[PDB]
Amino acid sequence: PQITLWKRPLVTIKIGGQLKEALLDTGADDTVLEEMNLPGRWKPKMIGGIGGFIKVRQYDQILIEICGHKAIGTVLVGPTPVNIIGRNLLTQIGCTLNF
Amino acid sequence: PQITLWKRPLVTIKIGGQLKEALLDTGADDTVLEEMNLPGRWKPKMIGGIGGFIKVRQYDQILIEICGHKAIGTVLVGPTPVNIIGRNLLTQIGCTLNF
Ligand SMILES: Cc1ccc(N)c(N)c1
Ligand SMILES: Cc1ccc(N)c(N)c1
């Protein structure tokens, strides 16, 4: 689709059997989701932004559907206040910025 | 232009006579720039993100060129580590996400 920016670009995602909403975030290197259990093996990670840095759990080769577009890759889970879809997954679904 | 997301979407901006680079950030409600002097009247503001909240100075009706596209509006200045072009200005230059 083509998404405009008058509101926050929150779209529907599906991950580990659950439906969520997530922000398509061209300013996020990585994908970061609110707390949730996800399969198996993780390795710690730190991410920073405005205000500071948080500890997250990194999970590799995770399947995630983003508005009907399936992608497999790295998902981080931790104390973010919004689910964020970062460039790691945006590249996979073919996402571009246009103006 | 059409920008892909393999790298961070850092583009050239011009503000208050200076050339800078800034991230086109669909995850930022607001525009936020590293420390710099700018004309006249400001009113305090707080912004949050990952890790916490920072204090910024809000400036209204500021002219800013974003890759050749001129926009006037609110610019915040404060201790951000990257210059961020948020949705307030992205809407003005006609910026959309497409996939
Ligand atoms: C369900 C699942 C969990 C972790 C990994 N690493 C993979 N590939 C798949
Ligand atoms: C140069 C300049 C500074 C502040 C404001 N508010 C405006 N409009 C213009």
Side-chain angles (χ1 to χ4, degrees), chain B residues 50-83:
Chain B
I50 289 272
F53 275 90
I54 58 168
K55 311 211 163 170
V56 301
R57 313 192 297 278
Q58 173 178 343
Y59 291 85
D60 299 300
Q61 315 142 312
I62 294 304
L63 183 52
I64 181 168
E65 198 140 354
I66 304 157
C67 293
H69 292 247
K70 284 173 214 280
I72 284 163
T74 295
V75 170
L76 310 178
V77 173
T80 179
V82 287
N83 293 317

mmCIF file of all heavy atoms in Angstrom, chain B residues 50-83:
data_model
loop_
_atom_site.group_PDB
_atom_site.id
_atom_site.type_symbol
_atom_site.label_atom_id
_atom_site.label_comp_id
_atom_site.label_asym_id
_atom_site.label_seq_id
_atom_site.Cartn_x
_atom_site.Cartn_y
_atom_site.Cartn_z
ATOM 1 N N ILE B 50 12.616 5.642 23.032
ATOM 2 C CA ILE B 50 13.249 4.505 23.644
ATOM 3 C C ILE B 50 14.228 5.021 24.760
ATOM 4 O O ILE B 50 14.988 5.972 24.546
ATOM 5 C CB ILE B 50 13.975 3.685 22.514
ATOM 6 C CG1 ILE B 50 12.965 2.966 21.572
ATOM 7 C CG2 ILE B 50 15.032 2.740 23.075
ATOM 8 C CD1 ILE B 50 12.441 1.497 21.965
ATOM 9 N N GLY B 51 14.221 4.418 25.936
ATOM 10 C CA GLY B 51 15.178 4.880 26.971
ATOM 11 C C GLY B 51 14.771 6.063 27.845
ATOM 12 O O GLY B 51 15.318 6.287 28.909
ATOM 13 N N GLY B 52 13.773 6.808 27.424
ATOM 14 C CA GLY B 52 13.389 7.959 28.200
ATOM 15 C C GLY B 52 12.950 9.217 27.479
ATOM 16 O O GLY B 52 12.466 9.179 26.326
ATOM 17 N N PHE B 53 13.031 10.344 28.196
ATOM 18 C CA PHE B 53 12.495 11.640 27.739
ATOM 19 C C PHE B 53 13.622 12.701 27.872
ATOM 20 O O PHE B 53 14.450 12.621 28.789
ATOM 21 C CB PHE B 53 11.300 12.085 28.608
ATOM 22 C CG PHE B 53 9.925 11.523 28.208
ATOM 23 C CD1 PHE B 53 9.453 10.316 28.744
ATOM 24 C CD2 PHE B 53 9.060 12.267 27.404
ATOM 25 C CE1 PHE B 53 8.175 9.820 28.416
ATOM 26 C CE2 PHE B 53 7.773 11.777 27.041
ATOM 27 C CZ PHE B 53 7.323 10.552 27.561
ATOM 28 N N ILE B 54 13.644 13.673 26.952
ATOM 29 C CA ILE B 54 14.636 14.757 26.932
ATOM 30 C C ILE B 54 13.872 16.077 26.861
ATOM 31 O O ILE B 54 12.717 16.127 26.429
ATOM 32 C CB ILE B 54 15.628 14.680 25.759
ATOM 33 C CG1 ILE B 54 14.920 14.690 24.382
ATOM 34 C CG2 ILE B 54 16.500 13.477 25.927
ATOM 35 C CD1 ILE B 54 15.870 14.899 23.138
ATOM 36 N N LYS B 55 14.521 17.146 27.320
ATOM 37 C CA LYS B 55 13.957 18.482 27.258
ATOM 38 C C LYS B 55 14.454 19.109 25.968
ATOM 39 O O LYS B 55 15.619 18.992 25.622
ATOM 40 C CB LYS B 55 14.454 19.327 28.473
ATOM 41 C CG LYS B 55 14.322 18.629 29.856
ATOM 42 C CD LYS B 55 14.063 19.695 31.045
ATOM 43 C CE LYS B 55 13.503 19.016 32.357
ATOM 44 N NZ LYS B 55 13.415 19.814 33.662
ATOM 45 N N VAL B 56 13.564 19.784 25.255
ATOM 46 C CA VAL B 56 13.957 20.454 24.020
ATOM 47 C C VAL B 56 13.400 21.847 23.991
ATOM 48 O O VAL B 56 12.478 22.162 24.770
ATOM 49 C CB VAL B 56 13.497 19.653 22.722
ATOM 50 C CG1 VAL B 56 14.079 18.276 22.675
ATOM 51 C CG2 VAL B 56 11.948 19.629 22.547
ATOM 52 N N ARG B 57 13.902 22.677 23.077
ATOM 53 C CA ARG B 57 13.298 24.001 22.829
ATOM 54 C C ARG B 57 12.459 23.956 21.578
ATOM 55 O O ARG B 57 12.971 23.573 20.527
ATOM 56 C CB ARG B 57 14.392 25.083 22.628
ATOM 57 C CG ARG B 57 15.487 25.031 23.671
ATOM 58 C CD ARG B 57 16.425 26.271 23.654
ATOM 59 N NE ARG B 57 17.207 26.468 22.432
ATOM 60 C CZ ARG B 57 18.364 25.863 22.119
ATOM 61 N NH1 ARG B 57 18.913 24.949 22.893
ATOM 62 N NH2 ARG B 57 18.973 26.161 20.989
ATOM 63 N N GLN B 58 11.197 24.380 21.674
ATOM 64 C CA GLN B 58 10.335 24.398 20.541
ATOM 65 C C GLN B 58 10.352 25.752 19.803
ATOM 66 O O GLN B 58 10.155 26.803 20.453
ATOM 67 C CB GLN B 58 8.901 24.090 20.960
ATOM 68 C CG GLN B 58 7.882 24.277 19.775
ATOM 69 C CD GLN B 58 6.443 23.938 20.149
ATOM 70 O OE1 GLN B 58 6.214 23.263 21.169
ATOM 71 N NE2 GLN B 58 5.440 24.402 19.311
ATOM 72 N N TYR B 59 10.559 25.716 18.479
ATOM 73 C CA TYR B 59 10.545 26.906 17.654
ATOM 74 C C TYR B 59 9.502 26.751 16.587
ATOM 75 O O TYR B 59 9.516 25.784 15.902
ATOM 76 C CB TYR B 59 11.885 27.083 16.921
ATOM 77 C CG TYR B 59 13.056 27.423 17.756
ATOM 78 C CD1 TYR B 59 13.788 26.433 18.375
ATOM 79 C CD2 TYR B 59 13.483 28.807 17.901
ATOM 80 C CE1 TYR B 59 14.914 26.767 19.157
ATOM 81 C CE2 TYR B 59 14.618 29.134 18.652
ATOM 82 C CZ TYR B 59 15.319 28.135 19.303
ATOM 83 O OH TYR B 59 16.416 28.417 20.129
ATOM 84 N N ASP B 60 8.649 27.757 16.408
ATOM 85 C CA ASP B 60 7.576 27.685 15.453
ATOM 86 C C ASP B 60 7.847 28.432 14.150
ATOM 87 O O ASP B 60 8.684 29.308 14.095
ATOM 88 C CB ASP B 60 6.247 28.125 16.120
ATOM 89 C CG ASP B 60 5.819 27.217 17.323
ATOM 90 O OD1 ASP B 60 5.606 25.991 17.136
ATOM 91 O OD2 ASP B 60 5.684 27.729 18.465
ATOM 92 N N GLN B 61 7.143 28.041 13.093
ATOM 93 C CA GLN B 61 7.295 28.621 11.740
ATOM 94 C C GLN B 61 8.762 28.791 11.265
ATOM 95 O O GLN B 61 9.213 29.874 10.804
ATOM 96 C CB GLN B 61 6.455 29.880 11.629
ATOM 97 C CG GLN B 61 5.081 29.668 12.215
ATOM 98 C CD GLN B 61 4.562 30.901 12.979
ATOM 99 O OE1 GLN B 61 5.262 31.506 13.823
ATOM 100 N NE2 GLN B 61 3.309 31.255 12.702
ATOM 101 N N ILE B 62 9.521 27.709 11.412
ATOM 102 C CA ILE B 62 10.937 27.683 10.997
ATOM 103 C C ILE B 62 10.967 27.156 9.607
ATOM 104 O O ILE B 62 10.332 26.137 9.333
ATOM 105 C CB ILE B 62 11.732 26.771 11.949
ATOM 106 C CG1 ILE B 62 11.747 27.404 13.356
ATOM 107 C CG2 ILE B 62 13.084 26.453 11.426
ATOM 108 C CD1 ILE B 62 12.324 28.927 13.434
ATOM 109 N N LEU B 63 11.698 27.840 8.727
ATOM 110 C CA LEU B 63 11.967 27.369 7.339
ATOM 111 C C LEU B 63 13.086 26.328 7.289
ATOM 112 O O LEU B 63 14.148 26.519 7.884
ATOM 113 C CB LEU B 63 12.456 28.590 6.493
ATOM 114 C CG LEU B 63 12.704 28.288 5.014
ATOM 115 C CD1 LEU B 63 11.551 27.608 4.260
ATOM 116 C CD2 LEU B 63 13.176 29.414 4.203
ATOM 117 N N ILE B 64 12.871 25.262 6.547
ATOM 118 C CA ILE B 64 13.832 24.164 6.459
ATOM 119 C C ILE B 64 13.667 23.588 5.069
ATOM 120 O O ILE B 64 12.549 23.431 4.578
ATOM 121 C CB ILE B 64 13.633 23.161 7.663
ATOM 122 C CG1 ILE B 64 14.616 21.984 7.649
ATOM 123 C CG2 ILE B 64 12.187 22.647 7.671
ATOM 124 C CD1 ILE B 64 14.536 21.276 8.986
ATOM 125 N N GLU B 65 14.781 23.358 4.387
ATOM 126 C CA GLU B 65 14.764 22.716 3.086
ATOM 127 C C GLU B 65 15.164 21.250 3.313
ATOM 128 O O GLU B 65 16.158 20.987 3.991
ATOM 129 C CB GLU B 65 15.810 23.346 2.164
ATOM 130 C CG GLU B 65 15.596 23.071 0.704
ATOM 131 C CD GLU B 65 15.895 24.280 -0.105
ATOM 132 O OE1 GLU B 65 16.152 25.357 0.496
ATOM 133 O OE2 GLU B 65 15.914 24.174 -1.351
ATOM 134 N N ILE B 66 14.393 20.319 2.759
ATOM 135 C CA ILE B 66 14.675 18.862 2.927
ATOM 136 C C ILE B 66 14.847 18.303 1.512
ATOM 137 O O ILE B 66 13.904 18.214 0.773
ATOM 138 C CB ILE B 66 13.576 18.185 3.715
ATOM 139 C CG1 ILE B 66 13.386 18.910 5.091
ATOM 140 C CG2 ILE B 66 13.770 16.631 3.833
ATOM 141 C CD1 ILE B 66 11.969 18.692 5.704
ATOM 142 N N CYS B 67 16.073 17.920 1.167
ATOM 143 C CA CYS B 67 16.430 17.552 -0.218
ATOM 144 C C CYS B 67 15.794 18.471 -1.258
ATOM 145 O O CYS B 67 15.185 17.980 -2.203
ATOM 146 C CB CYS B 67 15.963 16.135 -0.597
ATOM 147 S SG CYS B 67 16.751 14.880 0.234
ATOM 148 N N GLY B 68 15.911 19.779 -1.111
ATOM 149 C CA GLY B 68 15.325 20.678 -2.126
ATOM 150 C C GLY B 68 13.865 21.016 -1.909
ATOM 151 O O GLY B 68 13.336 21.864 -2.605
ATOM 152 N N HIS B 69 13.218 20.345 -0.958
ATOM 153 C CA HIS B 69 11.819 20.608 -0.663
ATOM 154 C C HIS B 69 11.700 21.494 0.572
ATOM 155 O O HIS B 69 12.156 21.115 1.667
ATOM 156 C CB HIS B 69 11.070 19.275 -0.428
ATOM 157 C CG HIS B 69 10.949 18.455 -1.663
ATOM 158 N ND1 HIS B 69 9.726 18.216 -2.279
ATOM 159 C CD2 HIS B 69 11.894 17.844 -2.424
ATOM 160 C CE1 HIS B 69 9.938 17.505 -3.374
ATOM 161 N NE2 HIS B 69 11.241 17.278 -3.487
ATOM 162 N N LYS B 70 11.079 22.656 0.389
ATOM 163 C CA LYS B 70 11.018 23.656 1.402
ATOM 164 C C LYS B 70 9.787 23.348 2.239
ATOM 165 O O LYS B 70 8.789 22.889 1.697
ATOM 166 C CB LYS B 70 10.886 25.035 0.728
ATOM 167 C CG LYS B 70 12.160 25.587 0.125
ATOM 168 C CD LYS B 70 11.762 26.819 -0.618
ATOM 169 C CE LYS B 70 12.621 26.968 -1.833
ATOM 170 N NZ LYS B 70 13.894 27.542 -1.462
ATOM 171 N N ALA B 71 9.878 23.561 3.551
ATOM 172 C CA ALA B 71 8.736 23.429 4.455
ATOM 173 C C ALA B 71 8.885 24.451 5.582
ATOM 174 O O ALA B 71 10.000 24.876 5.891
ATOM 175 C CB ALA B 71 8.619 21.948 4.971
ATOM 176 N N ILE B 72 7.782 24.885 6.174
ATOM 177 C CA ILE B 72 7.844 25.824 7.305
ATOM 178 C C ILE B 72 7.130 25.126 8.418
ATOM 179 O O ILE B 72 5.967 24.646 8.260
ATOM 180 C CB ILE B 72 7.244 27.256 7.041
ATOM 181 C CG1 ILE B 72 8.192 28.121 6.197
ATOM 182 C CG2 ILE B 72 7.090 28.043 8.321
ATOM 183 C CD1 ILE B 72 7.473 29.314 5.602
ATOM 184 N N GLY B 73 7.773 25.065 9.572
ATOM 185 C CA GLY B 73 7.041 24.585 10.691
ATOM 186 C C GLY B 73 7.825 24.459 11.896
ATOM 187 O O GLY B 73 8.863 25.106 12.034
ATOM 188 N N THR B 74 7.327 23.634 12.808
ATOM 189 C CA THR B 74 7.879 23.531 14.115
ATOM 190 C C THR B 74 9.180 22.720 14.141
ATOM 191 O O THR B 74 9.254 21.572 13.643
ATOM 192 C CB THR B 74 6.793 22.951 15.044
ATOM 193 O OG1 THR B 74 5.719 23.880 15.136
ATOM 194 C CG2 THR B 74 7.335 22.614 16.483
ATOM 195 N N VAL B 75 10.212 23.288 14.734
ATOM 196 C CA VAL B 75 11.467 22.554 14.851
ATOM 197 C C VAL B 75 11.817 22.565 16.315
ATOM 198 O O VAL B 75 11.729 23.597 16.979
ATOM 199 C CB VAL B 75 12.535 23.179 13.916
ATOM 200 C CG1 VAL B 75 13.850 22.656 14.137
ATOM 201 C CG2 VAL B 75 12.124 22.933 12.484
ATOM 202 N N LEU B 76 12.228 21.416 16.825
ATOM 203 C CA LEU B 76 12.705 21.279 18.193
ATOM 204 C C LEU B 76 14.242 21.110 18.171
ATOM 205 O O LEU B 76 14.849 20.515 17.255
ATOM 206 C CB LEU B 76 12.035 20.033 18.827
ATOM 207 C CG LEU B 76 10.550 19.893 18.709
ATOM 208 C CD1 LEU B 76 10.275 18.559 19.398
ATOM 209 C CD2 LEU B 76 9.835 21.032 19.443
ATOM 210 N N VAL B 77 14.894 21.649 19.192
ATOM 211 C CA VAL B 77 16.337 21.589 19.250
ATOM 212 C C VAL B 77 16.685 21.116 20.643
ATOM 213 O O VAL B 77 16.149 21.624 21.619
ATOM 214 C CB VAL B 77 16.919 23.021 19.073
ATOM 215 C CG1 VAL B 77 18.436 23.036 19.303
ATOM 216 C CG2 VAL B 77 16.463 23.645 17.728
ATOM 217 N N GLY B 78 17.577 20.155 20.747
ATOM 218 C CA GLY B 78 17.917 19.635 22.023
ATOM 219 C C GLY B 78 18.907 18.514 21.868
ATOM 220 O O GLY B 78 19.467 18.301 20.741
ATOM 221 N N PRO B 79 19.151 17.778 22.968
ATOM 222 C CA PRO B 79 20.215 16.768 22.989
ATOM 223 C C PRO B 79 19.832 15.477 22.325
ATOM 224 O O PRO B 79 19.920 14.455 22.947
ATOM 225 C CB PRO B 79 20.436 16.489 24.510
ATOM 226 C CG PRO B 79 19.322 17.175 25.233
ATOM 227 C CD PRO B 79 18.438 17.879 24.273
ATOM 228 N N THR B 80 19.373 15.543 21.077
ATOM 229 C CA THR B 80 19.261 14.341 20.225
ATOM 230 C C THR B 80 20.598 14.020 19.579
ATOM 231 O O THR B 80 21.302 14.894 19.236
ATOM 232 C CB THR B 80 18.259 14.551 19.070
ATOM 233 O OG1 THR B 80 18.255 13.346 18.308
ATOM 234 C CG2 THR B 80 18.654 15.740 18.171
ATOM 235 N N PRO B 81 20.943 12.746 19.426
ATOM 236 C CA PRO B 81 22.210 12.413 18.764
ATOM 237 C C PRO B 81 22.220 12.466 17.228
ATOM 238 O O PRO B 81 23.334 12.449 16.623
ATOM 239 C CB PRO B 81 22.458 10.978 19.230
ATOM 240 C CG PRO B 81 21.037 10.436 19.462
ATOM 241 C CD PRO B 81 20.217 11.557 19.938
ATOM 242 N N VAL B 82 21.017 12.499 16.614
ATOM 243 C CA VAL B 82 20.840 12.599 15.176
ATOM 244 C C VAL B 82 19.808 13.618 14.929
ATOM 245 O O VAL B 82 18.863 13.767 15.752
ATOM 246 C CB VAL B 82 20.329 11.258 14.501
ATOM 247 C CG1 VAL B 82 21.389 10.318 14.490
ATOM 248 C CG2 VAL B 82 19.235 10.613 15.269
ATOM 249 N N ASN B 83 19.932 14.329 13.816
ATOM 250 C CA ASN B 83 18.907 15.304 13.393
ATOM 251 C C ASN B 83 17.754 14.446 12.853
ATOM 252 O O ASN B 83 17.969 13.558 12.104
ATOM 253 C CB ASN B 83 19.395 16.268 12.283
ATOM 254 C CG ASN B 83 20.492 17.227 12.765
ATOM 255 O OD1 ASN B 83 20.421 17.783 13.850
ATOM 256 N ND2 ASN B 83 21.564 17.301 12.006
#
